[PDB]
Design a protein around this nucleic acid. Structure first.
Ligand SMILES: [Mg+2]
Ligand SMILES: [Mg+2]
Ligand SMILES: [Mg+2]
Ligand SMILES: [Mg+2]
Ligand SMILES: [Mg+2]
Ligand SMILES: [Mg+2]
Ligand SMILES: [Mg+2]
Ligand SMILES: [Mg+2]
Ligand SMILES: [Mg+2]
Ligand SMILES: [Mg+2]
Ligand SMILES: [Mg+2]
Ligand SMILES: [Mg+2]
Ligand SMILES: [Mg+2]
Ligand SMILES: [Mg+2]
Ligand SMILES: [Mg+2]
Ligand SMILES: [Mg+2]
Ligand SMILES: [Mg+2]
Ligand SMILES: [Mg+2]
Ligand SMILES: [Mg+2]
Ligand SMILES: [Mg+2]
Ligand SMILES: [Mg+2]
Ligand SMILES: [Mg+2]
Ligand SMILES: [Mg+2]
Ligand SMILES: [Mg+2]
Ligand SMILES: [Mg+2]
Ligand SMILES: [Mg+2]
Ligand SMILES: [Mg+2]
Ligand SMILES: [Mg+2]
Ligand SMILES: [Mg+2]
Ligand SMILES: [Mg+2]
Ligand SMILES: [Mg+2]
Ligand SMILES: [Mg+2]
Ligand SMILES: [Mg+2]
Ligand SMILES: [Mg+2]
Ligand SMILES: [Mg+2]
Ligand SMILES: [Mg+2]
Ligand SMILES: [Mg+2]
Ligand SMILES: [Mg+2]
Ligand SMILES: [Mg+2]
Ligand SMILES: [Mg+2]
Ligand SMILES: [Mg+2]
Ligand SMILES: [Mg+2]
Ligand SMILES: [Mg+2]
Ligand SMILES: [Mg+2]
Ligand SMILES: [Mg+2]
Ligand SMILES: [Mg+2]
Ligand SMILES: [Mg+2]
Ligand SMILES: [Mg+2]
Ligand SMILES: [Mg+2]
Ligand SMILES: [Mg+2]
Ligand SMILES: [Mg+2]
Ligand SMILES: [Mg+2]
Ligand SMILES: [Mg+2]
Ligand SMILES: [Mg+2]
Ligand SMILES: [Mg+2]
Ligand SMILES: [Mg+2]
Ligand SMILES: [Mg+2]
Ligand SMILES: [Mg+2]
Ligand SMILES: [Mg+2]
Ligand SMILES: [Mg+2]
Ligand SMILES: [Mg+2]
Ligand SMILES: [Mg+2]
Ligand SMILES: [Mg+2]
Ligand SMILES: [Mg+2]
Ligand SMILES: [Mg+2]
Ligand SMILES: [Mg+2]
Ligand SMILES: [Mg+2]
Ligand SMILES: [Mg+2]
Ligand SMILES: [Mg+2]
Ligand SMILES: [Mg+2]
Ligand SMILES: [Mg+2]
Ligand SMILES: [Mg+2]
Ligand SMILES: [Mg+2]
Ligand SMILES: [Mg+2]
Ligand SMILES: [Mg+2]
Ligand SMILES: [Mg+2]
Ligand SMILES: [Mg+2]
Ligand SMILES: [Mg+2]
Ligand SMILES: [Mg+2]
Ligand SMILES: [Mg+2]
Ligand SMILES: [Mg+2]
Ligand SMILES: [Mg+2]
Ligand SMILES: [Mg+2]
Ligand SMILES: [Mg+2]
Ligand SMILES: [Mg+2]
Ligand SMILES: [Mg+2]
Ligand SMILES: [Mg+2]
Ligand SMILES: [Mg+2]
Ligand SMILES: [Mg+2]
Ligand SMILES: [Mg+2]
Ligand SMILES: [Mg+2]
Ligand SMILES: [Mg+2]
Ligand SMILES: [Mg+2]
Ligand SMILES: [Mg+2]
Ligand SMILES: [Mg+2]
Ligand SMILES: [Mg+2]
Ligand SMILES: [Mg+2]
Ligand SMILES: [Mg+2]
Ligand SMILES: [Mg+2]
Ligand SMILES: [Mg+2]
Ligand SMILES: [Mg+2]
Ligand SMILES: [Mg+2]
Ligand SMILES: [Mg+2]
Ligand SMILES: [Mg+2]
Ligand SMILES: [Mg+2]
Ligand SMILES: [Mg+2]
Ligand SMILES: [Mg+2]
Ligand SMILES: [Mg+2]
Ligand SMILES: [Mg+2]
Ligand SMILES: [Mg+2]
Ligand SMILES: [Mg+2]
Ligand SMILES: [Mg+2]
Ligand SMILES: [Mg+2]
Ligand SMILES: [Mg+2]
Ligand SMILES: [Mg+2]
Ligand SMILES: [Mg+2]
Ligand SMILES: [Mg+2]
Ligand SMILES: [Mg+2]
Ligand SMILES: [Mg+2]
Ligand SMILES: [Mg+2]
Ligand SMILES: [Mg+2]
Ligand SMILES: [Mg+2]
Ligand SMILES: [Mg+2]
Ligand SMILES: [Mg+2]
Ligand SMILES: [Mg+2]
Ligand SMILES: [Mg+2]
Ligand SMILES: [Mg+2]
Ligand SMILES: [Mg+2]
Ligand SMILES: [Mg+2]
Ligand SMILES: [Mg+2]
Ligand SMILES: [Mg+2]
Ligand SMILES: [Mg+2]
Ligand SMILES: [Mg+2]
Ligand SMILES: [Mg+2]
Ligand SMILES: [Mg+2]
Ligand SMILES: [Mg+2]
Ligand SMILES: [Mg+2]
Ligand SMILES: [Mg+2]
Ligand SMILES: [Mg+2]
Ligand SMILES: [Mg+2]
Ligand SMILES: [Mg+2]
Ligand SMILES: [Mg+2]
Ligand SMILES: [Mg+2]
Ligand SMILES: [Mg+2]
Ligand SMILES: [Mg+2]
Ligand SMILES: [Mg+2]
Ligand SMILES: [Mg+2]
Ligand SMILES: [Mg+2]
Ligand SMILES: [Mg+2]
Ligand SMILES: [Mg+2]
Ligand SMILES: [Mg+2]
Ligand SMILES: [Mg+2]
Ligand SMILES: [Mg+2]
Ligand SMILES: [Mg+2]
Ligand SMILES: [Mg+2]
Ligand SMILES: [Mg+2]
Ligand SMILES: [Mg+2]
Ligand SMILES: [Mg+2]
Ligand SMILES: [Mg+2]
Ligand SMILES: [Mg+2]
Ligand SMILES: [Mg+2]
Ligand SMILES: [Mg+2]
Ligand SMILES: [Mg+2]
Ligand SMILES: [Mg+2]
Ligand SMILES: [Mg+2]
Ligand SMILES: [Mg+2]
Ligand SMILES: [Mg+2]
Ligand SMILES: [Mg+2]
Ligand SMILES: [Mg+2]
Ligand SMILES: [Mg+2]
Ligand SMILES: [Mg+2]
Ligand SMILES: [Mg+2]
Ligand SMILES: [Mg+2]
Ligand SMILES: [Mg+2]
Ligand SMILES: [Mg+2]
Ligand SMILES: [Mg+2]
Ligand SMILES: [Mg+2]
Ligand SMILES: [Zn+2]
Lengths: 151, 59, 101, 112, 116, 140
RNA sequence: GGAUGACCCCAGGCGGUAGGGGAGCGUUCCCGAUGCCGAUGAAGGCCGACCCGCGAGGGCGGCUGGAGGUAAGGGAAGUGC
RNA sequence: GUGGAGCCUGGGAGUGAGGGCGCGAGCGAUAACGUCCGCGUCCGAGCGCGGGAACAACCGAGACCGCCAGCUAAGGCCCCC
RNA sequence: CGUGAGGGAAAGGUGAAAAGAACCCCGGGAGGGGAGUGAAAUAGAGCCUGAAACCGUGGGCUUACAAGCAGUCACGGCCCCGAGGGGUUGUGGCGUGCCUAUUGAAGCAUGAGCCGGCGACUCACGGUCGUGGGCGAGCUUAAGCCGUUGAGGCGGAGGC
């Protein structure tokens, strides 16, 4: 804190309480006791746990019928209306949130602005995103790497 | 002496009880028989300048 | 004609037409229950020894409820012992119907 | 119907003026005028101004009649105090509060 | 993140202050004196609801005694007679009879002399 | 059912001839009458006992050597201010005080007890002024 | 008892300082949230003799206020005088 | 003898100023509301309740909450009561 | 403030918009009362909200023979909202503040004028036990690298 270390008034005989300097946490203006300092919240969760987790999350959607694999994306060439068309045609009316996973940059841009769509490259697939969304949609090529990842 | 000092704060009831005698009494006034303006008895009237039937002073 | 009945470890003077809160009876609202009589007075006097063989007072249960909350608080000085409990005593409301003397 | 006047931030101490205000609560406007005139206190000058201002309001704004006016309510509330240093022996400085009043007078008409 | 007192403490103090409505000077006005006053009161209440049970019983007894002695006996004799008669009417009631139903109290007195 | 509370009652006046009765044991009975504890509707927080008139107080009796030895006592608040007056003398100068002082000590302290003592009317000599009240002669 | 902490029944324990343990309440902030409540009135304040809760509290109502608030379930602390 | 008994392993303590009383001693003066040990008790922590005029440790008795019901304990029953 | 080195404050908010109140009235003025503006003016510039201590006006109940840790229990009176409640308190019963420290405090032992706000068991890294999970003769990666731009992965050196 910014203040000086001078003892503000003598220890005895002033009729007041004893104090040291005015930086002490007992003074308004003073320092804070055990407040926050810069902190690293991270930790290394076991790799097998992440692996097992990745798998189980997909598994959970699979078990709900909410996982859909797709061969390729028709006419989607980077336009939201294009993805939107395709999406409708594939049973995604936007009434359910979708984690769209594909390595196709053109398909990701096209879908990324939709409020109900979260998009990812297959290397990015992770459990918070799967669990956050109601429906999982993958390229086969996406699905291939995920299989390779949970192996 | 050794600096006496109140031992307890005086309660509002006590303070106000002490002021039970603090009310002003309103001025005692009588009419001036020449101009009928109220004034203190035994004073030359400041309204008209009369006292004891006569004109005592310019007002 | 009045009766002294005993319900709930307590005794009450009851006359037909009286509403009375007593300790909670295990009996559905609208049921009618029979109270013991320790004494009958009014026109004739009969004195139980302790209860009178034939008498009963017939009461209809209007309902069961909970008393207005009492705060039961405990405090002991200089020991930081403090406890605060809310209490509502269950009761049953009865209407006294007849005195079957 | 009532007419009121408030003098706010009058530089005099509430306890002092109230003593004067108390002399006129409930009185006819006329009696109140006489009383203030011959009341020997600083506060009389201030109460007198609020009274007369309230009277004017009664007559000019609120369609009330001077001959019927009486002090219906009157009170002194305390305003923000002026804090001032009063130097004492041995280097101590005391703090004198020069206090402040908000004086309210409220007139009604005494009917028939 | 920081969690400043904010609203919470004002809210505890009012709770206490409201319970202290009615008390004298600072006791209804200052949270501290309120609370102090309140500890006392929780204990008295507790203690006094215990003792109300006594307060009333002593009263019933004084009454029963007065009524007995109109019939030429005392409370101790009357109670023993009832015990021996097997009459279990409690004092709350003996006392009500003594005032509201004197013919009934008399018969009880009778039963009591007889029972001995 | 709540315990009964009497509505205001008209108070009974009673007359007691003190002649030859023993001071202390007459006193307790007077006290009872004053509290109202002969009444089956006794209530501790109101004055509902009898007014008591006592005559021939000067002819009260006392066992042992008390006339000589019982000392009544008064403290004036001044230095040296303890007066000791013996029974004999008190009887000889203000006899009604002897009964009065005894009964007073057998009443409760407090506002009510003080009030009850006012309901006691004690006279030396056989007569009293309370005829207007037609006091009921009481043997105790 | 029924199967499992659903709740009923019987019995017993339940003063407490240092202190061990358990279960909760509330404050700031995060996910929930591109959501939901909100000018037909956010938070905050002032009332309440009403409802729920053993309690810490939580509701509901009236007045004030005038633009924010934020669930179920979890997470993290500058968390209660 | 099934008890908030016991034993074993481990986690967390606090305490390491005691005090009155009875009994057994020492010290002291067959003194102290003295001091120091032993056995026990209570207060400590039961300054909660009844009695003892009042009163931590004497007598009675171990307060989960409620009742305008009953029986008792020590102590009491002439009035205060 | 201090000769000086040096110490070192407090102090934010009208309203969407100034539309920031022309003009009249009382007043020396300040201030107010009308008029006007505004959705709102106890948003009027001493301006959002506007708590509490503290001061006042008005009302209800109460109080001048009374003995008090200020309450509590009971009853009765009066006042209020409408077999009930609420406010008030006459009488009667009972009743030794809070915290601290102590063998022991109402204690004539400490601390506190009252109120509001600030105000004290945390964090890193190691350890030890317990606990929820993952894998299990095995478990685990560090720095870094790649990727992301609130996406994760690779990395076996090393450790147990
Ligand atoms: Mg510094
Ligand atoms: Mg500096
Ligand atoms: Mg510095
Ligand atoms: Mg320094
Ligand atoms: Mg320095
Ligand atoms: Mg230094
Ligand atoms: Mg010192
Ligand atoms: Mg000092
Ligand atoms: Mg100081
Ligand atoms: Mg100081
Ligand atoms: Mg100092
Ligand atoms: Mg310091
Ligand atoms: Mg220093
Ligand atoms: Mg410093
Ligand atoms: Mg700071
Ligand atoms: Mg600062
Ligand atoms: Mg700072
Ligand atoms: Mg700090
Ligand atoms: Mg620190
Ligand atoms: Mg520090
Ligand atoms: Mg820290
Ligand atoms: Mg860092
Ligand atoms: Mg950590
Ligand atoms: Mg890390
Ligand atoms: Mg999107
Ligand atoms: Mg979403
Ligand atoms: Mg001197
Ligand atoms: Mg002097
Ligand atoms: Mg000198
Ligand atoms: Mg002198
Ligand atoms: Mg002096
Ligand atoms: Mg002093
Ligand atoms: Mg004051
Ligand atoms: Mg006052
Ligand atoms: Mg005084
Ligand atoms: Mg204390
Ligand atoms: Mg105490
Ligand atoms: Mg304490
Ligand atoms: Mg202690
Ligand atoms: Mg405590
Ligand atoms: Mg004068
Ligand atoms: Mg005029
Ligand atoms: Mg000088
Ligand atoms: Mg000052
Ligand atoms: Mg000053
Ligand atoms: Mg913040
Ligand atoms: Mg804080
Ligand atoms: Mg705060
Ligand atoms: Mg607060
Ligand atoms: Mg608090
Ligand atoms: Mg609040
Ligand atoms: Mg609170
Ligand atoms: Mg009161
Ligand atoms: Mg007060
Ligand atoms: Mg006060
Ligand atoms: Mg106040
Ligand atoms: Mg409390
Ligand atoms: Mg109790
Ligand atoms: Mg008790
Ligand atoms: Mg009992
Ligand atoms: Mg007899
Ligand atoms: Mg018996
Ligand atoms: Mg019996
Ligand atoms: Mg008799
Ligand atoms: Mg004489
Ligand atoms: Mg007494
Ligand atoms: Mg049980
Ligand atoms: Mg148990
Ligand atoms: Mg027990
Ligand atoms: Mg316990
Ligand atoms: Mg446990
Ligand atoms: Mg815990
Ligand atoms: Mg909750
Ligand atoms: Mg909180
Ligand atoms: Mg919490
Ligand atoms: Mg944040
Ligand atoms: Mg968001
Ligand atoms: Mg939002
Ligand atoms: Mg809406
Ligand atoms: Mg609107
Ligand atoms: Mg509204
Ligand atoms: Mg907030
Ligand atoms: Mg909030
Ligand atoms: Mg609330
Ligand atoms: Mg609100
Ligand atoms: Mg906004
Ligand atoms: Mg939230
Ligand atoms: Mg939440
Ligand atoms: Mg979560
Ligand atoms: Mg803190
Ligand atoms: Mg076992
Ligand atoms: Mg044990
Ligand atoms: Mg044990
Ligand atoms: Mg152990
Ligand atoms: Mg621990
Ligand atoms: Mg240790
Ligand atoms: Mg220790
Ligand atoms: Mg040691
Ligand atoms: Mg020691
Ligand atoms: Mg020892
Ligand atoms: Mg020991
Ligand atoms: Mg020792
Ligand atoms: Mg010993
Ligand atoms: Mg012996
Ligand atoms: Mg010995
Ligand atoms: Mg020895
Ligand atoms: Mg000797
Ligand atoms: Mg002793
Ligand atoms: Mg000793
Ligand atoms: Mg000894
Ligand atoms: Mg010895
Ligand atoms: Mg011992
Ligand atoms: Mg200790
Ligand atoms: Mg004991
Ligand atoms: Mg013990
Ligand atoms: Mg004891
Ligand atoms: Mg005691
Ligand atoms: Mg205790
Ligand atoms: Mg005792
Ligand atoms: Mg005792
Ligand atoms: Mg006693
Ligand atoms: Mg009941
Ligand atoms: Mg018995
Ligand atoms: Mg015995
Ligand atoms: Mg005795
Ligand atoms: Mg007496
Ligand atoms: Mg210098
Ligand atoms: Mg300079
Ligand atoms: Mg310096
Ligand atoms: Mg500063
Ligand atoms: Mg603005
Ligand atoms: Mg602006
Ligand atoms: Mg002008
Ligand atoms: Mg002018
Ligand atoms: Mg102007
Ligand atoms: Mg004006
Ligand atoms: Mg104007
Ligand atoms: Mg308009
Ligand atoms: Mg509007
Ligand atoms: Mg407003
Ligand atoms: Mg506003
Ligand atoms: Mg201001
Ligand atoms: Mg605003
Ligand atoms: Mg404001
Ligand atoms: Mg203001
Ligand atoms: Mg205010
Ligand atoms: Mg008043
Ligand atoms: Mg007198
Ligand atoms: Mg009087
Ligand atoms: Mg009382
Ligand atoms: Mg009573
Ligand atoms: Mg009422
Ligand atoms: Mg009452
Ligand atoms: Mg009351
Ligand atoms: Mg009594
Ligand atoms: Mg005391
Ligand atoms: Mg004591
Ligand atoms: Mg405390
Ligand atoms: Mg302290
Ligand atoms: Mg110390
Ligand atoms: Mg010491
Ligand atoms: Mg010591
Ligand atoms: Mg004291
Ligand atoms: Mg002393
Ligand atoms: Mg003292
Ligand atoms: Mg000292
Ligand atoms: Mg002290
Ligand atoms: Mg010390
Ligand atoms: Mg100071
Ligand atoms: Mg204060
Ligand atoms: Mg504070
Ligand atoms: Mg720690
Ligand atoms: Mg650890
Ligand atoms: Mg572990
Ligand atoms: Mg694993
Ligand atoms: Mg395994
Ligand atoms: Mg190692
Ligand atoms: Zn003249």
């Amino acid at each position: 804190v910014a203040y000086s270390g001078r003892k503000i008034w003598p220890q005895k005989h002033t009729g007041r309480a004893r104090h040291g300097d005015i930086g002490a946490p007992i003074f308004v203006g003073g320092g804070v006791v055990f407040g926050p300092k810069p902190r690293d919240y991270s930790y290394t969760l076991p790799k097998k746990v992440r692996k097992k987790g990745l798998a189980m999350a997909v598994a959970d959607r699979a078990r709900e019928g909410k996982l859909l694999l797709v061969e390729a994306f028709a006419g989607v060439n980077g336009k939201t209306k294009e993805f939107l068309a395709w999406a409708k045609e594939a049973g995604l009316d936007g009434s359910e949130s979708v984690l769209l996973v594909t390595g196709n940059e053109l398909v990701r841009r096209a879908a990324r602005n939709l409020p109900w769509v979260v998009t990812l490259a297959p290397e990015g697939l992770n459990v918070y995103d799967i669990v956050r969304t109601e429906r999982l949609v993958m390229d086969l090529d996406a699905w291939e790497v995920f299989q390779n990842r949970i192996g | 002496a050794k600096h006496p000092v109140p031992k307890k704060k005086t309660s509002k009831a006590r303070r106000d009880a002490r002021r039970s005698h603090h009310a002003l009494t309103p001025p005692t006034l009588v009419p001036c028989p020449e101009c009928k303006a109220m004034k203190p008895p035994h004073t030359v009237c400041p309204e008209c300048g009369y006292y004891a039937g006569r004109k005592v002073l310019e007002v | 004609m009045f009766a002294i009945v005993k319900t709930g470890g307590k005794q009450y003077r009851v006359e037909p037409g009286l509403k009375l809160r007593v300790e909670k009876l295990d009996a559905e609202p609208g049921a009618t229950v029979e109270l013991p009589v320790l004494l009958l007075g009014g026109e004739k006097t009969v004195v139980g020894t302790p209860v009178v063989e034939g008498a009963s007072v017939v009461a209809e249960v209007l309902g069961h409820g909970r008393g207005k909350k009492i705060l039961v608080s405990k405090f002991k000085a200089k020991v930081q012992y403090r406890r605060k409990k809310g209490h509502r005593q269950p009761y049953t409301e009865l209407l006294i119907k007849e005195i079957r003397g | 119907m009532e007419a009121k006047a408030i003098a706010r931030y009058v530089r005099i101490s509430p306890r002092k003026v109230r003593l004067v205000v108390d002399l006129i609560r409930g009185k006819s406007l006329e009696e109140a005028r006489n009383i203030l005139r011959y009341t020997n206190k600083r506060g009389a000058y201030f109460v007198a101004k609020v009274l007369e201002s309230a009277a004017a309001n009664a007559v000019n704004n609120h369609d009330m009649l001077e001959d019927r006016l009486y002090v219906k309510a009157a009170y002194v509330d305390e305003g923000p105090a002026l804090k001032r240093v009063l130097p004492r022996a041995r280097g101590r400085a005391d703090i004198i509060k020069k206090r402040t009043s908000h004086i309210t007078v409220i007139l009604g008409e005494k009917h028939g | 993140p920081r969690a400043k007192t904010g609203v919470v403490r004002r809210r505890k103090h009012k709770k206490i202050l409201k319970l202290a409505k009615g008390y004298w000077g600072l006791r209804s006005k200052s949270f501290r004196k309120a609370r102090e006053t309140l500890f006392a009161a929780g204990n008295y209440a507790y203690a006094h609801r215990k003792r109300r049970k006594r307060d009333f019983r002593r009263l019933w007894i004084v009454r029963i005694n007065a009524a007995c002695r109109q019939h030429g006996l005392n409370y101790s004799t009357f109670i023993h007679g009832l015990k021996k008669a097997g009459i279990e009417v409690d004092r709350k009631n003996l006392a009500d009879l003594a005032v509201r139903e004197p013919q009934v109290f008399a018969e009880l007195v009778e039963r009591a002399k007889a029972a001995q | 059912m709540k315990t009964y509370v009497p509505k205001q009652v008209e108070p009974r006046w009673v007359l007691i001839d003190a002649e030859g009765k023993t001071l202390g044991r007459l006193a307790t009975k007077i006290a009872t009458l004053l509290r109202g504890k002969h009444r089956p509707d006794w209530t501790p927080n109101v004055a509902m006992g009898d007014f008591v008139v006592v005559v021939n107080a000067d002819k009260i009796r006392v066992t042992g050597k008390k006339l000589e030895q019982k000392i009544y006592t008064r403290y004036s608040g001044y230095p040296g201010g303890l007066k000791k007056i013996p029974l004999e003398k008190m009887l000889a100068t203000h006899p009604e005080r002897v009964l009065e002082h005894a009964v007073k000590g057998m009443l409760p302290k407090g506002p009510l007890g003080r009030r009850l003592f006012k309901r006691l009317k004690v006279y030396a000599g056989p007569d009293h002024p309370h005829q207007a009240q037609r006091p009921e002669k009481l043997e105790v």
